[PDB]
Design an enzyme around this catalytic site. Structure first.
Site, PDB file in Angstrom:
ATOM      1  N   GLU A  69      -3.969   3.531 -11.053  1.00 45.11           N
ATOM      2  CA  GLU A  69      -4.722   2.278 -10.978  1.00 45.11           C
ATOM      3  C   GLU A  69      -5.742   2.209 -12.099  1.00 45.11           C
ATOM      4  O   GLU A  69      -5.906   1.163 -12.739  1.00 45.11           O
ATOM      5  CB  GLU A  69      -5.432   2.136  -9.632  1.00 45.11           C
ATOM      6  CG  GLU A  69      -4.530   2.153  -8.437  1.00 45.11           C
ATOM      7  CD  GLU A  69      -5.324   2.061  -7.131  1.00 45.11           C
ATOM      8  OE1 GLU A  69      -5.897   0.986  -6.836  1.00 45.11           O
ATOM      9  OE2 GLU A  69      -5.399   3.075  -6.410  1.00 45.11           O
ATOM     10  N   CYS A  83       0.821  -1.208   0.000  1.00 45.74           N
ATOM     11  CA  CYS A  83       0.000   0.000   0.000  1.00 45.74           C
ATOM     12  C   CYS A  83       0.859   1.264   0.000  1.00 45.74           C
ATOM     13  O   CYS A  83       1.556   1.549   0.980  1.00 45.74           O
ATOM     14  CB  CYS A  83      -0.938   0.021   1.211  1.00 45.74           C
ATOM     15  SG  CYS A  83      -1.930   1.540   1.213  1.00 45.74           S
ATOM     16  N   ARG A 106      -0.257   4.700   2.729  1.00 47.45           N
ATOM     17  CA  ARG A 106      -0.258   4.545   4.191  1.00 47.45           C
ATOM     18  C   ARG A 106       0.074   5.816   4.954  1.00 47.45           C
ATOM     19  O   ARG A 106      -0.015   5.790   6.187  1.00 47.45           O
ATOM     20  CB  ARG A 106       0.717   3.444   4.607  1.00 47.45           C
ATOM     21  CG  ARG A 106       0.191   2.029   4.333  1.00 47.45           C
ATOM     22  CD  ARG A 106       1.258   0.997   4.675  1.00 47.45           C
ATOM     23  NE  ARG A 106       2.267   0.826   3.630  1.00 47.45           N
ATOM     24  CZ  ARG A 106       3.428   0.191   3.810  1.00 47.45           C
ATOM     25  NH1 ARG A 106       3.744  -0.319   5.016  1.00 47.45           N
ATOM     26  NH2 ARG A 106       4.265   0.042   2.788  1.00 47.45           N
ATOM     27  N   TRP A 119      -9.312   5.927  -1.428  1.00 48.46           N
ATOM     28  CA  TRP A 119      -9.586   6.569  -2.704  1.00 48.46           C
ATOM     29  C   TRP A 119      -8.517   6.131  -3.696  1.00 48.46           C
ATOM     30  O   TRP A 119      -7.493   5.550  -3.332  1.00 48.46           O
ATOM     31  CB  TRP A 119      -9.631   8.092  -2.586  1.00 48.46           C
ATOM     32  CG  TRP A 119      -8.447   8.713  -1.916  1.00 48.46           C
ATOM     33  CD1 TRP A 119      -7.228   8.965  -2.470  1.00 48.46           C
ATOM     34  CD2 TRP A 119      -8.379   9.184  -0.561  1.00 48.46           C
ATOM     35  NE1 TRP A 119      -6.402   9.564  -1.552  1.00 48.46           N
ATOM     36  CE2 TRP A 119      -7.087   9.717  -0.371  1.00 48.46           C
ATOM     37  CE3 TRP A 119      -9.280   9.191   0.510  1.00 48.46           C
ATOM     38  CZ2 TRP A 119      -6.669  10.248   0.844  1.00 48.46           C
ATOM     39  CZ3 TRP A 119      -8.874   9.742   1.720  1.00 48.46           C
ATOM     40  CH2 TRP A 119      -7.582  10.268   1.876  1.00 48.46           C
TER      41      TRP A 119
HETATM   42  C1  HEM Z   1      -6.600   6.571   1.399  1.00 51.40           C
HETATM   43  C2  HEM Z   1      -6.181   6.406   0.134  1.00 51.40           C
HETATM   44  C3  HEM Z   1      -5.432   5.137  -0.355  1.00 51.40           C
HETATM   45  C4  HEM Z   1      -4.672   5.084  -1.473  1.00 51.40           C
HETATM   46  C5  HEM Z   1      -4.379   6.246  -2.450  1.00 51.40           C
HETATM   47  C6  HEM Z   1      -4.156   3.728  -1.601  1.00 51.40           C
HETATM   48  C7  HEM Z   1      -3.335   3.230  -2.583  1.00 51.40           C
HETATM   49  C8  HEM Z   1      -3.089   1.890  -2.826  1.00 51.40           C
HETATM   50  C9  HEM Z   1      -2.627   1.327  -4.079  1.00 51.40           C
HETATM   51  C10 HEM Z   1      -2.330   2.143  -5.355  1.00 51.40           C
HETATM   52  C11 HEM Z   1      -2.503  -0.003  -3.913  1.00 51.40           C
HETATM   53  C12 HEM Z   1      -2.073  -1.031  -4.976  1.00 51.40           C
HETATM   54  C13 HEM Z   1      -3.405  -1.537  -5.533  1.00 51.40           C
HETATM   55  C14 HEM Z   1      -3.246  -2.418  -6.746  1.00 51.40           C
HETATM   56  O1  HEM Z   1      -2.257  -2.261  -7.505  1.00 51.40           O
HETATM   57  O2  HEM Z   1      -4.138  -3.284  -6.969  1.00 51.40           O
HETATM   58  C15 HEM Z   1      -2.902  -0.334  -2.553  1.00 51.40           C
HETATM   59  C16 HEM Z   1      -2.915  -1.590  -2.003  1.00 51.40           C
HETATM   60  C17 HEM Z   1      -3.378  -1.933  -0.749  1.00 51.40           C
HETATM   61  N1  HEM Z   1      -3.996  -1.071   0.125  1.00 51.40           N
HETATM   62 FE1  HEM Z   1      -3.982   1.017  -0.035  1.00 51.40          FE
HETATM   63  N2  HEM Z   1      -4.624   2.990  -0.529  1.00 51.40           N
HETATM   64  C18 HEM Z   1      -5.431   3.801   0.249  1.00 51.40           C
HETATM   65  C19 HEM Z   1      -6.094   3.373   1.395  1.00 51.40           C
HETATM   66  C20 HEM Z   1      -6.108   2.120   1.986  1.00 51.40           C
HETATM   67  C21 HEM Z   1      -6.927   1.711   3.110  1.00 51.40           C
HETATM   68  C22 HEM Z   1      -7.960   2.650   3.779  1.00 51.40           C
HETATM   69  C23 HEM Z   1      -6.645   0.420   3.384  1.00 51.40           C
HETATM   70  C24 HEM Z   1      -7.202  -0.503   4.504  1.00 51.40           C
HETATM   71  C25 HEM Z   1      -7.715  -0.034   5.654  1.00 51.40           C
HETATM   72  C26 HEM Z   1      -5.598  -0.003   2.444  1.00 51.40           C
HETATM   73  C27 HEM Z   1      -4.980  -1.233   2.370  1.00 51.40           C
HETATM   74  C28 HEM Z   1      -4.326  -1.769   1.269  1.00 51.40           C
HETATM   75  C29 HEM Z   1      -3.890  -3.149   1.085  1.00 51.40           C
HETATM   76  C30 HEM Z   1      -4.033  -4.302   2.110  1.00 51.40           C
HETATM   77  C31 HEM Z   1      -3.316  -3.244  -0.122  1.00 51.40           C
HETATM   78  C32 HEM Z   1      -2.705  -4.514  -0.739  1.00 51.40           C
HETATM   79  C33 HEM Z   1      -3.718  -5.069  -1.753  1.00 51.40           C
HETATM   80  C34 HEM Z   1      -3.283  -6.366  -2.429  1.00 51.40           C
HETATM   81  O3  HEM Z   1      -2.227  -6.952  -2.056  1.00 51.40           O
HETATM   82  O4  HEM Z   1      -4.017  -6.820  -3.354  1.00 51.40           O
HETATM   83  N3  HEM Z   1      -5.315   1.054   1.634  1.00 51.40           N
HETATM   84  N4  HEM Z   1      -3.253   0.844  -1.917  1.00 51.40           N
HETATM   85  N1  LIG Z   2      -5.342 -11.431 -10.886  1.00 50.24           N
HETATM   86  C1  LIG Z   2      -5.785 -12.232 -10.013  1.00 50.24           C
HETATM   87  N2  LIG Z   2      -5.669 -11.968  -8.703  1.00 50.24           N
HETATM   88  C2  LIG Z   2      -5.386 -10.738  -8.191  1.00 50.24           C
HETATM   89  C3  LIG Z   2      -6.069  -9.609  -8.638  1.00 50.24           C
HETATM   90  C4  LIG Z   2      -5.785  -8.356  -8.110  1.00 50.24           C
HETATM   91  C5  LIG Z   2      -4.824  -8.213  -7.117  1.00 50.24           C
HETATM   92  C6  LIG Z   2      -4.543  -6.836  -6.557  1.00 50.24           C
HETATM   93  C7  LIG Z   2      -5.760  -5.936  -6.778  1.00 50.24           C
HETATM   94  N3  LIG Z   2      -6.161  -5.295  -5.509  1.00 50.24           N
HETATM   95  C8  LIG Z   2      -7.273  -4.337  -5.714  1.00 50.24           C
HETATM   96  C9  LIG Z   2      -6.930  -3.169  -4.833  1.00 50.24           C
HETATM   97  C10 LIG Z   2      -6.305  -3.500  -3.639  1.00 50.24           C
HETATM   98  C11 LIG Z   2      -5.934  -2.503  -2.758  1.00 50.24           C
HETATM   99  C12 LIG Z   2      -6.155  -1.176  -3.099  1.00 50.24           C
HETATM  100  C13 LIG Z   2      -6.788  -0.821  -4.296  1.00 50.24           C
HETATM  101  N4  LIG Z   2      -6.988   0.493  -4.613  1.00 50.24           N
HETATM  102  C14 LIG Z   2      -7.194   1.487  -3.748  1.00 50.24           C
HETATM  103  N5  LIG Z   2      -6.780   2.658  -4.016  1.00 50.24           N
HETATM  104  C15 LIG Z   2      -7.904   1.136  -2.479  1.00 50.24           C
HETATM  105  C16 LIG Z   2      -8.821   0.144  -2.220  1.00 50.24           C
HETATM  106  C17 LIG Z   2      -9.121   0.220  -0.872  1.00 50.24           C
HETATM  107  C18 LIG Z   2      -8.355   1.258  -0.342  1.00 50.24           C
HETATM  108  O1  LIG Z   2      -7.586   1.828  -1.355  1.00 50.24           O
HETATM  109  C19 LIG Z   2      -7.166  -1.832  -5.190  1.00 50.24           C
HETATM  110  C20 LIG Z   2      -4.139  -9.336  -6.655  1.00 50.24           C
HETATM  111  C21 LIG Z   2      -4.426 -10.595  -7.187  1.00 50.24           C
HETATM  112  C22 LIG Z   2      -6.436 -13.503 -10.462  1.00 50.24           C
HETATM  113  C23 LIG Z   2      -6.895 -13.957 -11.690  1.00 50.24           C
HETATM  114  C24 LIG Z   2      -7.392 -15.229 -11.459  1.00 50.24           C
HETATM  115  C25 LIG Z   2      -7.230 -15.528 -10.113  1.00 50.24           C
HETATM  116  O2  LIG Z   2      -6.630 -14.447  -9.488  1.00 50.24           O
HETATM  117 CL   LIG Z   3      -9.181  -1.162  -9.094  1.00 43.33          CL
END
Ligand code: HEM
Ligand SMILES: N=C(Nc1ccc(CCNCc2cccc(NC(=N)c3ccco3)c2)cc1)c1ccco1
Ligand SMILES: [Cl-]
Ligand code: HEM
Ligand SMILES: N=C(Nc1ccc(CCNCc2cccc(NC(=N)c3ccco3)c2)cc1)c1ccco1
Ligand SMILES: C[C@H](O)[C@H](O)[C@H]1CNc2nc(N)[nH]c(=O)c2N1
Ligand SMILES: C[C@H](O)[C@H](O)[C@H]1CNc2nc(N)[nH]c(=O)c2N1
Ligand SMILES: [Cl-]
Ligand SMILES: [Gd]
Ligand SMILES: [Gd]
Ligand SMILES: [Gd]
Ligand SMILES: [Zn+2]
EC number: 1.14.13.39
Lengths: 402, 403
Positions: B284, B107, B110, B279
């Site tokens: 993304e 993330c 953070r 947000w």
């Molecule tokens: C407030 C604005 C926030 C922004 C701009 C942001 C941004 C991002 C971005 C760009 C990613 C990568 C997403 C991707 O490539 O699929 C990400 C991942 C992640 N975010 Fe944040 N985030 C925000 C808030 C949060 C919040 C509120 C939470 C939880 C309380 C959070 C938890 C996570 C987690 C756990 C991931 C890893 C997702 C994964 O491994 O698939 N984020 N965030």
């Molecule tokens: N591609 C696959 N899996 C897979 C797909 C996607 C991912 C990562 C995508 N996280 C989506 C994601 C996660 C965290 C943040 C955001 N955005 C924000 N800003 C946000 C959300 C909340 C707060 O902030 C978007 C990881 C694994 C797949 C295909 C078949 C089986 O699995």
């Molecule tokens: Cl998305």
């Protein structure tokens, strides 16, 4: 055997080559250090020597043959008599190619079979070193039709200092400390620029003054050597549609020739073994010209493009960076100097990954260095999982001589 | 004993002493690094995790070693001995959710980790009540475009009873209609969840941006289908500030990124349904969702409209079209007054987070490949920052799909 997935296409391979990884990298199950730039007896030499000879003869299909046993016994006697041993010229060639093929941070390894090896293992002095190097630069430049090459200087051994090229590349622009803290020229070369000056080099005052070479023969101080200007092919940078770009006075050199890494083959070590290929355009247009700690020209270009630089959300940095990379590609092609853009190069590396899966069950690759520094996810390597591990023969980093 | 960590832009050096507290093992070994892989993969084991979490909580409020600290440790230990599990105090749930965000290595947002609205839904009893909690979350977080970070925590996993689950990967997702050819109309990332929706009774649309229904699972029940009220789902039509034909592409995206398929782990307790939202960072949408070849894949069509030369890679038509799509996303969200952050501002703020965390905890777990944005990587400061990836708890974790 790690499972390796491509997320664009969904294909799966298994890396079986990683099991054979020689040395240890910096990661543990507790934490991953993959993003760090620098990852932290006669019987020792014999074991590495044996594995390399076995590698080599397996690769020419003389596996276990009579010539295989004869070479193994020769190495054993040579180490007992002298403490080291001598590669045959075919082994030196094979080893240099393998060390390139094994380099995890190299996106250009589709070319690994085509390498010109210059054997300089009989070199005796810095003057002779300079002649070998000039021959290398001439051959490799080839009037702009660049050809990959390596020159291998004598190996290290006990009781005798190493051969060293003090410069990090054969072609480097000076970086001049200024009275107001700033740097004129390349900030990356501020140290070697001072080393050249201290060793009696008359400094220039431009942003692109080609440095002399500081060459070190064993157990002697380094010697300054001027590169003849007609030997150093440079490309003035212009833009195909932005007519004012030429007036920025930017340029770069044709030949990327890395001179500070150590070549390791069968337990032997070559501290001076300069290698060259050709540039990928992002190396110049993104890293060398736009890094904040290099030429840092991004804002200059954005002002000339009349971009809105007071807010990040106009993406003025991204648009200027792209046009600098356009200028680089355009200027090299116009000058008929070999160059490859980051789309073509990552597409070829994907083919190399496929070829290597069939050739030997995997390929060591450092994702953070393979993915280009602009437009990462627009290239297919971004969506390719990769396994990083260290095979030998290899290119390794080494401490500075001073 | 502690990894040296260097910033190559500035030359500065720290040591990550926090990594020494990593509580679960990752995929790397001294033999080979697997950092680039997407998926890196009981009484007194529960108790050591619980005790560690209670210690973290009492450290955060600067009452470590207090009577309240000892008494709560004893209280947790006695509940685990009697029941095999325990219940978080409300204050511990709020702190634990924030800590899981703070610990998330992938993330980049953070800097915001202390600002998180925590909705306590641990008394939820049905899929219908699940839907009410989710709609309230969406309304609060969207806030008519002025987005607010929030998480809703549904009941924890407990033996003898099935999990609460949200089958959708996000609360707002566009349908992906698998064609007979093998092509897709809509979002290809959502083909599976779309087919599950249809199987469970949803009448599908035939657009490219059809908002999916929710499949909500209450314990020991098949999933139940719930339609989101259209006025709950804030969307942004995409236009470009200077390319007026761009609006004719008919592109749009949604305001609220609300991840609903990850498991929240706090002190050894597991919360399989705990959707969280913040947000968007503009890359993304503009880079991955619209330009990935296996997503909406619009790069070539935009470049053709821009009258770029797509027959040769060296014109950098891909790079130019991608930058303008990102411009459209940012311009369109700003125009519609929906919170969004560009990749330059987001990575700059992440650098400040790294400095904050170095002083607060002696390091920060971070996944370089995920923190560096998908365009213009080395133009952002995180590119030049070495990073140490490791797993701390509280944590957000991947979990298997419920089907
Ligand atoms: C407030 C604005 C926030 C922004 C701009 C942001 C941004 C991002 C971005 C760009 C990613 C990568 C997403 C991707 O490539 O699929 C990400 C991942 C992640 N975010 Fe944040 N985030 C925000 C808030 C949060 C919040 C509120 C939470 C939880 C309380 C959070 C938890 C996570 C987690 C756990 C991931 C890893 C997702 C994964 O491994 O698939 N984020 N965030
Ligand atoms: N591609 C696959 N899996 C897979 C797909 C996607 C991912 C990562 C995508 N996280 C989506 C994601 C996660 C965290 C943040 C955001 N955005 C924000 N800003 C946000 C959300 C909340 C707060 O902030 C978007 C990881 C694994 C797949 C295909 C078949 C089986 O699995
Ligand atoms: Cl998305
Ligand atoms: C033929 C065209 C080639 C291209 C386009 C190419 C491209 C690249 C690029 C872009 C890098 C990253 C460098 C950086 O970011 O600083 C790299 C690294 C590297 N290349 Fe290649 N290369 C080529 C040929 C070669 C050759 C001929 C050799 C050796 C025989 C070689 C060995 C290496 C090594 C060892 C590295 C790692 C350097 C380091 O870690 O500092 N390459 N290459
Ligand atoms: N900055 C430092 N370290 C550091 C600097 C740079 C690097 C990697 C850069 N190698 C330069 C390099 C290496 C490999 C390929 C190219 N390009 C080519 N196409 C090419 C050359 C030959 C064939 O192809 C360029 C690694 C570490 C530093 C300061 C003080 C101590 O270290
Ligand atoms: C900190 C990080 O490892 C460092 O900036 C790396 C990232 N990836 C890179 N990739 C390439 N090709 N060259 C580099 O110098 C770097 N630098
Ligand atoms: C194979 C590779 O790890 C994969 O494409 C990763 C790289 N970095 C990423 N970074 C972010 N933020 N999001 C992603 O989905 C990915 N995907
Ligand atoms: Cl370079
Ligand atoms: Gd002007
Ligand atoms: Gd300024
Ligand atoms: Gd226009
Ligand atoms: Zn690793």
């Amino acid at each position: 055997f790690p499972r390796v997935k491509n997320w664009e296409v969904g294909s799966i391979t298994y890396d079986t080559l990683s099991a054979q990884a020689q040395q240890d990298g910096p990661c543990t199950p507790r934490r991953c250090l993959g993003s760090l730039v620098f990852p932290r007896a006669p019987e020792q030499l014999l074991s590495q020597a044996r594995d390399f000879i076995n590698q080599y003869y397996s690769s020419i299909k003389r596996s276990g043959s009579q010539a295989h046993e004869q070479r193994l016994q020769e190495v054993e006697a040579e180490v007992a008599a002298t403490g080291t041993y001598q590669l045959r010229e075919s082994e030196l060639v094979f080893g240099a190619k393998q060390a390139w093929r094994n380099a995890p941070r190299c996106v250009g390894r589709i070319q690994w079979g085509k390498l010109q090896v210059f054997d300089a293992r009989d070199c005796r002095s810095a003057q002779e070193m300079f002649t070998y190097i000039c021959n290398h630069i001439k051959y490799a430049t080839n009037r702009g039709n660049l050809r990959s090459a390596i020159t291998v200087f004598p190996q290290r051994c006990p009781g005798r200092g190493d051969f060293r090229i003090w410069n990090s590349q054969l072609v480097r622009y000076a970086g001049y400390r200024q009275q107001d803290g700033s740097v004129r020229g390349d900030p990356a070369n501020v140290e070697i620029t001072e080393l050249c000056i201290q060793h009696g080099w008359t400094p220039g005052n431009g942003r692109f003054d080609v440095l002399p070479l500081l060459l070190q023969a064993p157990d002697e101080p380094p010697e300054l050597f001027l590169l003849p200007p007609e030997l150093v092919l440079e490309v003035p940078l212009e833009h195909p549609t932005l007519e004012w770009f030429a007036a920025l006075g930017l340029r770069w050199y044709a030949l990327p020739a890395v001179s500070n890494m150590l070549l390791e083959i069968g337990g032997l070590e070559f501290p001076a073994a300069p290698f060259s290929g050709w540039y990928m355009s992002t190396e110049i247009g993104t890293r060398n010209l736009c890094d904040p700690h290099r030429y840092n020209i991004l804002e200059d270009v954005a002002v000339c493009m009349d971009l809105d630089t007071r807010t990040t959300s106009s993406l003025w940095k991204d648009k200027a960076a792209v046009e600098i990379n356009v200028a680089v590609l355009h200027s090299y092609q116009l000058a008929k100097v070999t160059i490859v853009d980051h789309h073509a190069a990552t597409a070829s590396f994907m083919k190399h990954l496929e070829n290597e899966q069939k050739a030997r069950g995997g390929c060591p690759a450092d994702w953070a260095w393979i993915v280009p520094p602009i437009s990462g996810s627009l290239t297919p390597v971004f969506h390719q999982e990769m396994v990083n591990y260290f095979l030998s023969p290899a290119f390794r980093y080494q401490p500075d001589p001073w």
